[PDB]
Amino acid sequence: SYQLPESLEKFTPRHPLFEAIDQLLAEPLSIRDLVITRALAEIRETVAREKRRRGELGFDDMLSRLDSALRSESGEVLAAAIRTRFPVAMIDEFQDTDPQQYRIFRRIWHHQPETALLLIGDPKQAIYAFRGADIFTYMKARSEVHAHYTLDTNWRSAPGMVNSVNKLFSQTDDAFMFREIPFIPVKSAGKNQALRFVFKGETQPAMKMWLMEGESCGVGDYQSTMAQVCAAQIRDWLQAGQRGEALLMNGDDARPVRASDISVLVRSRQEAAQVRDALTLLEIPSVYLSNRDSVFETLEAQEMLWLLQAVMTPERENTLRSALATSMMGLNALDIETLNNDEHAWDVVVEEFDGYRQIWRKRGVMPMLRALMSARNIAENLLATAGGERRLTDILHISELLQEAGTQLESEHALVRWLSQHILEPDSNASSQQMRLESDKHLVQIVTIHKSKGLEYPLVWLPFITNFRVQEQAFYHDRHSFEAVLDLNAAPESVDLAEAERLAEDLRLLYVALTRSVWHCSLGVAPLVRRRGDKKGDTDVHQSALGRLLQKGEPQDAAGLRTCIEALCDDDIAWQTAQTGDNQ
Amino acid sequence: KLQKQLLEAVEHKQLRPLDVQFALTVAGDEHPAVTLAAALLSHDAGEGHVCLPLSRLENNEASHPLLATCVSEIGELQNWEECLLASQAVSRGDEPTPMILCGDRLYLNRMWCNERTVARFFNEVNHAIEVDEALLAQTLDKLFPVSDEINWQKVAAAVALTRRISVISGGPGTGKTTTVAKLLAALIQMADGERCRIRLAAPTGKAAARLTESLGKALRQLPLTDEQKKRIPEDASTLHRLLGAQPGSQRLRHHAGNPLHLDVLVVDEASMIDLPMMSRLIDALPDHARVIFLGDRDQLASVEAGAVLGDICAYANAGFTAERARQLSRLTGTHVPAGTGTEAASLRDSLCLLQKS
Amino acid sequence: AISDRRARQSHPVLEAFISLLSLPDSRFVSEDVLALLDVPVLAARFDITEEGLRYLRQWVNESGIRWGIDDDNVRELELPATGQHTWRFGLTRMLLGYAMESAQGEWQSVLPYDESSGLIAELVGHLASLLMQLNIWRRGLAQERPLEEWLPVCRDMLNAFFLPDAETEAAMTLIEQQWQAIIAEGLGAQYGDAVPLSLLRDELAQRLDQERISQRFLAGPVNICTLMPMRSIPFKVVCLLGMNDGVYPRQLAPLGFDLMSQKPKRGDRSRRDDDRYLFLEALISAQQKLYISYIGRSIQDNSERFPSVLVQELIDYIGQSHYLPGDEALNCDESEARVKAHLTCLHTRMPFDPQNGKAHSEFVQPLPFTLPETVPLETLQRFWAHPVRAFFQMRLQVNFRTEDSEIPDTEPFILEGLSRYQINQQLLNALVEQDDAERLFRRFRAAGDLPYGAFGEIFWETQCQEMQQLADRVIACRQPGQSMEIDLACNGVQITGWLPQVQPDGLLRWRPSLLSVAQGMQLWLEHLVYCASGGNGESRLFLRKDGEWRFPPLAAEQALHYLSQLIEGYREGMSAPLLVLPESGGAWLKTCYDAQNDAMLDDDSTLQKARTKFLQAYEGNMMVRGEGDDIWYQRLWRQLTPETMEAIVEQSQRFLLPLFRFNQ
């Protein structure tokens, strides 16, 4: 690396070969590009050939099958026939505008007049990129369409909240590095122009941000120590609401604050554990709404496999005794000890399981299984135990799943291998999730951003919305062609273009986080520096979402941020310092 | 090919699918004599033969057109030894070869390993133990009431205490349990300081029960000290249980890597033990142990695969040797008969016999 | 009485038949072959018993058979001829293993299989005969032919594979009759060319899954049937299900090029109009009562649904034709709302809530037990490896067995777990004797558990390097020695067992594992029994990542006392479920106790530090499992309380103090 003319001269040609090493150390070398390119087309070709040969078709395949027929010249009569039958078109929400779909729409209805099309879109909030939604299709689509319309009336929240979400974005124009998405002037409603939240005498302003004391501390430090501050405020709010100190009121009518409607939002699943301990220490149980855990991962499926397979093997005395020792069955050590030595008590259960096997071989899983659920008097006995009703739901969920398994599969013995196959890999599909239990009362609800769409929340908490995560793999969209260009190498010019998109999507998700909180919203912040040292005079939060729009696109420090935080505070920003303490 | 020829035999019910598939998948596409020999060897090994001699296979000459089968290629294949030695699937014990031909009769590698282990165990392991001959004579005349002529019970006791490994053969109703009780009592009276763990075994449970009750009656008849009767062993176990045979696995809990610790052992009715059980029992025996064998030659031995008792007891007809004959003449005080010849000194020394019913 | 069911009674015979008729494109997955063997008729044809099925299962699992049948099959799909992990290779390996022993060496780059040597090996021949028959029909059924030649192959296949019985005679006659009928129609329509087998396959599938049973519509009990077209019978009570949106009426699109769909006439019959007429007919067919239900709330996320337009119109008409007796004249719209609220009732989400017992006794109990006289050493070892697991699996003879898993889908491209742990142990045991590694490498490449060629070569080259790096400091202090017998007595209890590698220096072991308190306790038990049976000498054990356990020599009285304590603990623990965690308690005692002062600093700061370390040990990171997460502990308790936490800390301290006392 130091043997280059661009290196040693700044740190003579010196040889004719001295310029050759500068050639071969400016562009790297590997086999990875060729291997990946040779893999990518052939895997797609082979899976499509196998699907065609066996005779199936995919939901991700029918769109491409339609697109080729529309692209080809054979289907112009089809293009005329569909527009004859359907002389109008409107699209819901337009964020998940796939390039396959937009090509169809622009080829069919952008021209061929006296047949109009409508578009309803919400140009931000863009949170289906991991599913496959692309914002560049909408960016291209905005150019050709001429008319543009905007609606203002909220009908939902406070004028203070509307003023906060209008004020927070007026520091810099083009807050998302894109000229193709506009400013956000929103006007509040008039019917509900008096929504006030009052607490302990005086009223309470809209947005309350929490500033962290110190110079260079991670958000992990908040999640360890100061994540309990939000739980402390929540506990204070609930204790004041049950004592008639806090109020929730419109006009002159009022209601006390329940222990249910206060919610807190996080970004990833990992910090759910980092926030749960901050709340269970102060003795408030918390319900979890991001429970994407499959039902198959619990103890009940593992016990259920043994219980069902012992029916299949009713003679092998070693594996028959697995089921009677389970926590579902509910026996004791003295209960098993008196049955091991005795012969007749052992002989009793043999015909009971033999009849169960006959019932399964005659009718199905449900007549077999519900007979066992009824015979041994177990559902009532689980109810007397501490939280047995919580465990009992999973048995019925698993039993329901076995019916849709056994209406497809016909081999009786193969249901066991189906179950053991589905045990291993925990897919996150729809039907394999849990159900909720309580509705008379509700705890504090924790849910992720993606599963927080279109619901009304009175009180929110956004603690960890200051940390970021930089991207590494270079994959960006061209500023003119808007295609998915892909460089398998590590060009920093492409890296910056792929990083600006990650910067914009975090801002969009930040805007998602603030279409909530009818009455009051609160959040935290932390000046985290990337380097391990503290005293350097700079920060790295302006590389994240909120820090860039609060630092006006400039690199600053704590000294340059302290008065910048406090400058714009007027009647809507109740800021407080970090509180390293416990109130109760 | 010959595949169809082998597959009418399964409809003839003359062979087994195991045997025909093994023979085909080992022989391949060589000369048909190799395939036929493989099939016949597998079938006869299944039927209860340890090995098949070449004389039967090359002199029955009725299972095929043997002339067109044997005499097929260059040279004369009726030299069957050269014909199968030039093949690939038969060797002389060097390469890990499926078929072994060493003692002019072919058989599988497992039988070869077990046979060589048994031959090594008898012909290179026996040890001439040494104790005081005067104390032997004193204990003999103290315990055995016979003092007038030579008695075969006394000769059996003398040779059993003489050698580490011994074989006793005789018919029923000859006081074998009484004699082995005399041996046990003499050994326990001989060894006072060192511990002597004694265990009994039998091939089957009814034989174990018979042995235990007969030994118990004999030891109640012949009195000793209370500590001596305490050191007398209590009960016997079946040999499968003694080796700890798992119902599913073939890995033993008392294999050679985990040797069972035992000082002496008495085994009855060896005629109901085939060769592999002898091999695995040899595998599970420590170095400083003494084992006594019991059985009968005249009764029907294992005419199926593996009868160690008859083929070892057949060497006893040669007689004793002069050195041990004179030594036991000194010990017993009577005229002990002597023999001639030389086959194996320790083995021929370690075969006694009975002559009184 | 349930009517209008589909004709499917002897399901697995038909399913096995259609799967076997899907032959000439299958890749012969071992799971599918065992699925074929699962059929009792097929098993009884080739005299294979359910007892032998388990032997076949574990033999196929251990052998390594994953892919298709033969070299023709692996070369037909244009793949390199690896020559391994096929059925011919597995059967050859198993037959060679019947022929000889495994330790004597490879013969044709195939390592013989140790298990099948006894009187169990007839299953090998039966399996080979079945595989030969399958290969013969695989070559046979590929070619196309006219229908008159396709006629007898179904009957030929049936009598070739299936053993007859009177029970399945109806199914066999059904298959034969349907096949003969299809080919009879095809020949009677005078076709001339050949046909691929897929047409006959899926046509026979649809023809067998077409027949119905409509016999018992008027059995006498309550009738369950579909909304039968062309039917109108008076009855006293009529009830309907499934009246939501998008389900009733049925929404069938036409064929897309129909002629009558563009010019309607009088005699048309659409499914939508048929359903909408049948609804009115069912309404007028009632005599006394009626009952209509639908689904309003989705169970997934408490969203909203809607009923159908028919019942919407019905309830609107009911509301607009009547009014309540209470509020006789208030307003029509409020009357509508109140009647519609009155006529609709809702039910609770779960069927156990009262709006529409005795607790579980604790599992731990005092148990009678009498101490035997003689105990083996390895019994104590297996007990003290994990005492709760031991109490479950030797006291009352249960085991929560993870049942026999399924065959892996392919040859292992990369090795983890025991599949490389025993390889590491074998390589270390070979390298400690300074012998050639190439012979053992050839042995494993013959056995068939290595990546094909270069990847396996590189894997061997790095594993040998790391094992040699350990083996250098292993062999730096080597001394020859032999084994000896162990016999000792303590508290009137005989202890016997064997112990290898006894040398005048002391003891020495090596294991390709990580350092642990369990391994420390193992070496502790062995060193205590060795020192108690005379024998002055220290002990040493090196592991991976430069670990070491080493103990000073002891006295006979102290050794006897420590063995007495351990024996009494074992006696108590097998009858009462003594609870010891050999990792979390070990970490807690290491943090809490200092060896220099021989005392515990018991301030609350170090207590909280030890509690933090203990909780981190009980629940580890997201990248390894925690010791507290285990099936025995889950069966014991479902949650942790500070009472049991204190009990665990106290008992672990009492029973593991000497380990950290004598550790150095």
Q: How far is B25 from chain C (nearest CA, A)?
A: 7
Backbone gaps in chain C, preceding residues (C–N over 2.5 A): 356
Q: B121 and B56 in one domain?
A: no
Contacts B–C by Cβ distance under 8 A: 63
Beta bridge partners of A255: A248
Q: Do B94 and B237 lie in a common domain?
A: no
Question: What does DSSP assign to residue C360?
Answer: P
- CA C423 to CA C415: how far, in whole Å? 10
Burial class (CB in 10 A: 0-12, 13-18, 19+), C530: buried
> What distance in Å separates residue C461's CA from the closest CA in chain A?
23
Q: How far apart are CA A62 and CA A48, in angstroms?
A: 12
Residue B93 sits in the same domain as residue B126:
no
Residues of chain B found within 8 Å of residue C47, distances taken between Cβ atoms: none
Contacts of C92 in chain B (CB under 8 A): 25
Bridge-based pairing of strands B90-91 and C212-213 is unpaired
Burial of A547 (0-12, 13-18, 19+ CB in 10 A): buried
Q: Tally Cβ neighbours within 10 Å of residue A27.
A: 7
C192-204 CB burial, b ≥16 within 10 A, e <16: eeeeebeebeeeb
Instruction: Based on the fold, state whether residues B92 and B166 are members of the same structural domain.
Output: no
Q: At C14, is the secondary structure helix, strand, or coil?
A: helix
Name A37's Cβ contacts closer than 8 Å, sequence gap at least 6.
Answer: A488
Instruction: Tell me phi and psi for residue C641, to 5 degrees.
Output: -125, 150
Strand-pair category, C482-490 with C493-502: antiparallel
Nearest by Cα to C398 from A323, A348, A310:
A323
**Residue B15 three-state SS:** coil
Alpha helices per DSSP H over C344-406: 377-385, 387-390
Are the Cβ atoms of B17 and C122 closer than 8 angstroms? yes
Point out the residue among C100, C107, C126 whose CB comes nearest to the CB of B17: C126
CA dihedral C334, C339, C345, C346 (to 10 degrees): -20
- DSSP per position, A304-358: HHHHHHHHH-SS-HHHHHHHHTSTTTT--HHHHHHHHH-SHHHHHHHHHHHHHHH
Instruction: Provide the CATH number for the domain around residue B101.
Output: 1.10.10.1020
Question: What's the structural domain count of chain B?
Answer: 2
DSSP codes of every residue in C470-539? HHHHHHTT----EEEEEEEEETTEEEEEEEEEE-SSEEEEE-SS---HHHHHHHHHHHHHHHHTS---EE
CA separation for the pair C193, C210 (Å, rounded): 27
Query: 3-state secondary structure string, C129-186?
Result: HHHHHHHHHHHHCCCCECHHHHCCHHHHHHHHHCCCCCCCHHHHHHHHHHHHHHHHHH
CA C607 to CA C588: how far, in whole Å? 9
Residue numbers in C near A333 (CB within 8 A): 363-365, 367, 396, 577
d(CA A576, CA A229): 12
* B209 and B189 together in one domain: yes
Would residue C411 be called left, alpha or beta, if left means φ above 0 and alpha means ψ between -120 and 50 degrees? beta
State how far the Cα of C272 lies from the Cα of B348, in Å rounded to an integer: 104
Q: Which amino acid is at A518?
A: V
Q: Are A261 and A458 in contact (CB under 8 A)?
A: yes
Axis crossing angle, helix C309-321 with helix C332-343, rounded to the nearest 10:
120
Tokens describing residue C460: 């061997």
How far apart CA C86 and CA C33 sit, in angstroms, is 13
What span, in angstroms and rounded, lies between the C-alpha atoms of A441 and A351? 46
Give the closest residue to A214 by CA, choosing from A539, A584, A582, A452. Answer: A539
Q: What are the residue ranges of helices labelled H in C285-401?
A: 309-321, 332-343, 377-385, 387-390
Q: What's the reported resolution, in angstroms, to a tenth? A: 4.2
In one letter, which amino acid is B264? Answer: V
Going by C-alpha positions, the residue among B293, B296, B288 that lies closest to residue B277 is B293
**C238-256 CB burial, b ≥16 within 10 A, e <16:** bebeebbeeebbeeeeeee
Measured CA distances, B64 to B9, B57, B68, B85, C22 (Å): 12, 11, 9, 22, 42
- Closest-CA distance of chain A to residue C275, Å: 26
Residue corresponding to tokens 């004391």: A213
A and B in touch (3+ CB pairs within 8 angstroms): no
C640 token code pair = 């942790």
Residue A524, φ and ψ in degrees, nearest 5: -120, 175
Task: Classify residue A275 by its DSSP letter.
Answer: H
Radius of gyration of chain C measured on its C-alpha atoms: 38
Q: Which amino acid is at A515?
A: T
Joined together, the tokens standing for residue A27 give 């562009």
Q: Answer whether C277's CB lies under 8 Å from C255's CB.
A: no
Nearest one of C403, C510, C523 to C61, comparing CA atoms: C403
**Domain identity same for B11 and B152:** no
Closest CA to B306 of B118, B104, B172, B180: B118
Touch test C–A: 3 Cβ pairs or more under 8 Å:
yes
Q: Please state, in angstroms and as integers, the Cα–Cα distance from residue B243 to each residue in A135, B274, B285, C31, C165, following that order.
A: 75, 16, 11, 37, 45
Residue of chain B minimizing CA distance to C51: B248
**DSSP H or E run through A521:** strand A521-524
| CA nearest to C518, candidates C586, C573, C569 | C586
Neighbours of chain A (3+ CB pairs under 8 A): C
Assigned token pair, C556: 């006979």
- In our burial notation (b when 16+ CB lie closer than 10 A, e otherwise), range A135-167 reads bbbbbbbeeeeeeeeeeeebeebbbbbbbbbee
Contact A321 C15 (CB under 8 A): no
CA angle B141, B144, B150 (to 5 degrees): 85
| Chain B meets chain C (3+ C-beta pairs below 8 A) | yes
- One-letter amino acid for residue C524 of the chain: W
Q: Subunits that touch chain C (at least 3 Cβ pairs < 8 angstroms)?
A: A, B
Chain B positions touching C498 (Cβ under 8 A) are 258-259, 261
Strand, coil or helix: B134: helix
Amino acid at B268: D
Positions at the binding site of B for ATP: 170-177
In this structure, what CATH number is given to the domain that contains residue B292? Answer: 3.40.50.300
* Residues B135, B190 contacting (CB under 8 angstroms): yes
Long-range CB pairs of A245-249, under 8 A, 24+ apart, other chains included: A245/A199, A245/A200, A246/A198, A246/A199, A246/A200, A247/A197, A247/A198, A247/A199, A248/A197, A248/A458, A248/A519, A249/A196, A249/A197, A249/A198
**CA dist., res. C428 & res. B131, Å (int):** 46
Q: How many angstroms separate the CA of residue C140 from the nearest CA in chain B? A: 18
Is the Cβ pair A336, C396 closer than 8 Å? yes
Contact (CB, 8 A) for C163 and C45: yes
State how far the Cα of A76 lies from the Cα of C609, in Å rounded to an integer.
Answer: 76
Helix (H) or strand (E) holding C656: helix C642-662
Length of chain C: 664
Residue B204 belongs to domain spanning? 110-354
List the beta bridge partners of residue A207.
Answer: A521, A573
Residues belonging to chain B with any Cβ–Cβ distance to chain C shorter than 8 Å: 16-22, 25-26, 95-98, 108-110, 113, 250, 258-259, 261
Q: How many CA atoms lie within 13 A of C492 on its CB side?
A: 2
At B178, list the tokens.
């009484």
Instruction: Report CB contact under 8 Å: C496, B261.
Output: yes
Closest Cβ opposite residue C357 in set A325, A384, A414? A384
A321 to C631: CB separation less than 8 angstroms, yes or no: no
Looking at CA atoms only, how far is residue C483 from chain A in angstroms?
37
Around A512, how many Cα atoms within 13 Å sit in the side-chain half-sphere? 25
Q: What is the spatial order of strands in the sheet that A195-199 belongs to? A: A195-199, A246-250, A253-255
Q: First and final CA of chain C: distance in angstroms?
A: 79
Q: Count of CB atoms within 10 A of residue A123's CB?
A: 19
Q: Are A527 and A561 a contacting pair, CB within 8 Å?
A: yes
3-state secondary structure of B251: coil
Which residues does residue C375 pair with via DSSP β-bridges, in sequence order?
A: C495
Give CA–CA dist C206/C210, Å, rounded: 6
DSSP H or E run through A118? strand A118-119
Place of tokens 């894997």: C459
Query: What angle in degrees, to the nearest 10, is found between the helix axes of A299-312 and A317-324?
Result: 140
Are B18 and C121 in contact (CB < 8 Å)? Answer: yes
Residue C226 neighbours by CB distance under 10 Å: 8
Handedness of CA C629, C634, C639, C640 (dihedral sign): negative
CA dihedral B183, B189, B191, B196 (to 10 degrees): 60
Q: Cα separation of B117 and B279, whole Å?
A: 7
- Same-domain pairing of B157 and B261: yes
Longest C-alpha distance within chain A, in Å?
A: 102
Provide the strand spans (E) within B57-124.
90-91, 99-101, 105-108
Strands A207-210 and A90-91, by their bridges, are: unpaired
Chain A contact present for C406, CB below 8 A? yes
Task: Write out the two tokens for A115.
Answer: 């047949």
**Obtained via which technique?**
cryo-EM
Instruction: Tell me the C-alpha distance between C279 and C272, whole Å.
Output: 11
* B98·C122 Cβ contact <8 A: no
DSSP, collapsed to helix, strand or coil, labels residue A538 as coil
Strands A444-448 and B52-53, bridge-based pairing? unpaired
Interface of C with A in 620-659 (CB under 8 A): 622, 631, 634-635, 638
Return contacts of C334-341, CB within 8 angstroms, 24+ apart.
Answer: C340/C315
Distance CA C240, CA C247 (A): 13
CB A86 within 8 A of CB A112: no
DSSP-assigned beta bridge partners for residue A323:
none
Domain boundary among B47, B77, B109: B109
Residue count of chain A, please give it: 584
Same domain, residue pair B28 and B166 = no
Q: What's the N-to-C CA distance of chain A in angstroms?
A: 61
Which residues does A205 contact at the CB level (< 8 Å), separation at least 6? Answer: A160, A571, A572, A573, A574
**Residues B104 and B135 placed together within one structural domain of the fold:** no
CB C19 within 8 A of CB C161: no
Peptide linkage before C249 cis (omega within 30 of 0)? yes
DSSP state of C545: T
C-alpha C509 chain-centroid distance: 36
CA distance B129 to A324: 59
| Pick from C338, C398, C367, C352: nearest CA to C635 | C398
- B258 CB neighbours in chain C (<8 A) are 498
Cβ B290 vs Cβ B262: under 8 Å = no
CB atoms within 10 A of CB C604: 8
| φ and ψ at residue A254, rounded to 5 degrees | -140, 160
Q: What backbone phi and psi angles, to 5 degrees, belong to C316?
A: -65, -40
Contacts of C200 (CB under 8 A, 6+ apart): C150, C182
Contact predicate C100/B98, CB 8 Å: yes
Same domain, B52 and B195: no
Q: Which of B44, B74, B109 is the last residue of a domain?
A: B109
DSSP B141-204: HHH----SS--HHHHHHHHHHHBSEEEEE--SSS-HHHHHHHHHHHHHHH--SS---EEEEESS
Task: Tell me how far CA of residue A411 lies from CA of A47, A405, A457, B357, C406, in angstroms.
Answer: 28, 11, 49, 69, 17
Say yes or no for a CB contact (<8 Å) between C12 and A332: no
CB-based burial label for A112 (10 Å; 0-12, 13-18, 19+): exposed
Residue C493 amino acid letter: V
On whether both B79 and B182 belong to a single domain, the answer is no
Closest C-alpha to A258, from A229, A284, A228: A284
B175 & B281 share domain: yes
Q: Is A424 exposed, middle or buried (0-12, 13-18, 19+ CB in 10 A)?
A: exposed
- Residue where the block lists tokens 């007809």: B317
Residue B160 burial by CB count (10 A; 0-12/13-18/19+): exposed, middle or buried? buried
Q: Which residues contact C337 (CB under 8 A, 6 or more apart)?
A: none
Q: Concatenated DSSP letters for A431-467? A: TTS------SS--EEEEESTT--S---SB--BTTTT-
Q: In what order do the strands lie in the sheet with A263-266?
A: A263-266, A444-448, A286-288
Choosing from B41, B76, B109, the residue where a domain stops is B109
SS3 C338: helix
CA-to-CA distance for A503 and A197, rounded, in angstroms?
34
Per-residue tokens: C400: 């929560």
